Subunit: 326 residues, 3 copies
């Protein structure tokens, strides 16, 4: 449980001591942020400043924000080392039918900046995507594109990046929520504003205005419950053949009420599933762990965010704003 701090130049390293244990917070939100924040009061080299590394439970975080007030007090915000990949650019672009492996190779070919990667896909879920000018961006933006293109998640262990198809990210647990109303341990925002039961996927349109392939349709089994309601189609001008489009549609269709909540659950479990039972209507569906907030040096339980909201993290935060406002 010792925290280690090193200056950017790695000449001063020590155990961090003068920090507020109740301040100390580790926070993660799926594909948005992973950071630690804490407050230190002091009473003589530099160990903790901009660009210092802070080592906590086997992971490295780098000081990017730091306040100075005066004894003296500093409030640190340190994003996980993963986020430093944004310092890298791949200006070169490639076009063609490529695997995730070929794309990741493209990102890091000229300067890997200490990053490595692997793809875990033993069932061969993934397939090629037709890239057009893949590149000309910073490494993080490029990775984020791949996540969307291939239907994968990235799980950083320091600068080693593990990519997995969404299907094998998170396992079914034995946790479940029988939801009748909000409690101390579980509060949810639920709506049907985005409830849809059928969606189309369209590829490229030729110079004559004709489609390369007939659009793909994906229909939820909940079409029986709610009737046909059309989600905005996926339209991807790069696809001249269906490719992974069908799976893309199923990944995107919001065929259950958008449900986002903050819970205390009864280990690391990013992406793990909890069965959500919406009791008033007897409708059962999975919600996933999409965020956490830990105070590891206190007796507080981790605060977990569970969601099935496929739209966006901003849509998820809107729902949580309603949860917090009450």
């Amino acid at each position: 449980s010792d925290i280690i701090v090193a200056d950017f130049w790695k000449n001063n390293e020590e155990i961090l001591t003068d920090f507020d244990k109740d301040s100390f917070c580790e926070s993660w939100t799926e594909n948005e942020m992973w950071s630690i924040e804490f407050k230190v009061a002091q009473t003589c080299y530099s160990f903790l400043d901009y660009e210092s590394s802070v080592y906590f439970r086997g992971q490295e975080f780098v000081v990017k924000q730091l306040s100075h007030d005066a004894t003296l007090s500093k409030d640190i915000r340190a994003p996980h080392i993963y986020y430093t990949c944004q310092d890298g650019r791949q200006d070169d672009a490639i076009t063609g039918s490529f695997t995730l492996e070929q794309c990741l190779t493209h990102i890091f070919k000229t300067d890997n900046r200490g990053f490595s990667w692997e793809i875990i896909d033993p069932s061969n879920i993934l397939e090629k995507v037709q890239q057009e000018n893949f590149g000309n961006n910073n490494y993080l933006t490029l990775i984020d594109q791949l996540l969307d293109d291939y239907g994968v998640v990235v799980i950083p262990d320091n600068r080693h990046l593990v990519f997995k198809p969404r299907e094998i990210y998170g396992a079914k647990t034995e946790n479940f929520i029988r939801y009748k109303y909000n409690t101390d341990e579980a509060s949810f925002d639920i709506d049907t504003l985005s409830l849809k039961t059928k969606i189309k996927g369209y590829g490229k349109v030729d110079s004559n205005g004709n489609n390369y392939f007939s659009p793909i349709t994906y229909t939820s089994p909940e079409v029986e419950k709610w009737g046909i309601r059309w989600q905005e189609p996926v339209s991807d001008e790069r696809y001249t053949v269906a490719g992974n489009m069908q799976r893309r549609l199923k990944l995107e269709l919001q065929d259950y009420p958008a449900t986002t909540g903050s819970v205390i659950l009864k280990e690391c479990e990013k992406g793990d599933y909890v069965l959500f039972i919406y009791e008033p209507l007897g409708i059962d569906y999975d919600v996933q762990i999409v965020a956490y907030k830990k105070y590891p040096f206190t007796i507080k339980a981790p605060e977990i965010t569970l969601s099935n909201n496929k739209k966006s993290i901003v849509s998820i935060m809107a729902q949580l704003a309603k949860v917090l406002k009450g």
Copy 2:
């Protein structure tokens, strides 16, 4: 005055009883929202839940947001049935010189989803608009485009949609405001940040860079009061002939101070006009009813929003934020 509630499946229907009469709110804002919200406390089928219909004064509202707290309390927000047209998509697109009637026909040809429409235009104000790829969107977005293209308003009576030219939407009343300053019954934000007196309308430019027609200019009579000040021109690449452009310009020019206020007025009157007399300068101009907020089960007078702000509803809300802040 009985409210009726039916579940989505129409197997349970009843008179709604356990609701907070002071909570009960009907709100409308021109081309933005129309909803009811209320709170119900309970102490056994499902009647009121997601996708339930709530019938109030001859109109249908559908539960899309619902809170659950615990006795038990639920806060409902139910947009008018009109807004459910967004569940429909017209993926097909059409190009050509079309009437509003032809466009509306296009929207609902494959699946009307229970919607109908009519156009009331006895004076033949409306004309054709040159559409390019009209379609490929949800029904609400398409309708909103038509409102802008043709200079019309839509007035939903449940799923029956009445379209009217802006000229015959709202009549001149005998209400007037002699404005010297803000009172309990009328408070206004007024500015001249967007005050303009002349505007141009441009159509398509050809492959050589030449315009299909010379731009149309519309000059306010207030050019005598304020001098020439140029509004951002209308530019519409679809127009190869003037068409309805001149009228478009007059619909858009903000030739009076942008004036937005919340009033209590001394029936349904959406779009009706109130004469606004800006007393300090002796300048008279019309403001229109663009929103209301009713508490029908209380003795409170409807709160009305009057505006002549042609920019946007966000611009109108900015002004009201100033009214509310004081």
Copy 3:
């Protein structure tokens, strides 16, 4: 120190008297706003209303926002006369390799609206920029483009506009801040989220996909301190030759921690430099005066904003939001 007010029509002019001296505020933020605001209580022509001119220390401000409450009180917000150039449009566009002088001439050729200009560049820093369709916009938007294209600042003296290369805007003062932590007189937000040490500049790409010239690279001397970290490149499709690109890159690279603070300093000094010494790491760099807030009729010292944040004024305000929140 007499304030003079004239109505828009210039028939009523007088010394302004019934105003709250503590209310009276002059505020400037670099290329964003320059205004006065004040409150007047009254107890009879119109002198002070919408479009009135308010003359303060040799500059003209025009009333655009005005509140009315009731004795009677009015809160005025009056942007500097410079901002009225937005009432002018240059619909015509030009393409070619042009000097700043040729562009400014283009803006004001048809109707100068009382504006004049001059360029002060005795060292001949400025050069031609390849314009494509320069024009078709309001005068302020066009000026703002030129500021970015040519690397210049505009310093309005009423409607006379002085343009200067960034190098000769602001001089080195003898003011310095030895920063260890925040005090009553100086509080700063500092981060390294945008810290970059190398950047590329790209021009036009031809029909075959090849660049007209090899990209230009600019490397900070701080690459020795922080390592190579790539900023988003400048990419300008108009450039078929390097032109002023190298200078553009140096103008844009954020090679020191983004540092924004509110200070009381110990005359007009827009753009003047203060040496910022970040004491904990012994890193010295310039910050510039980018905003002020004055209460000229009080004993309050001007509040100055110092920054070296090259991203945007919104990025600068974000940092100040952190300063204000604490």
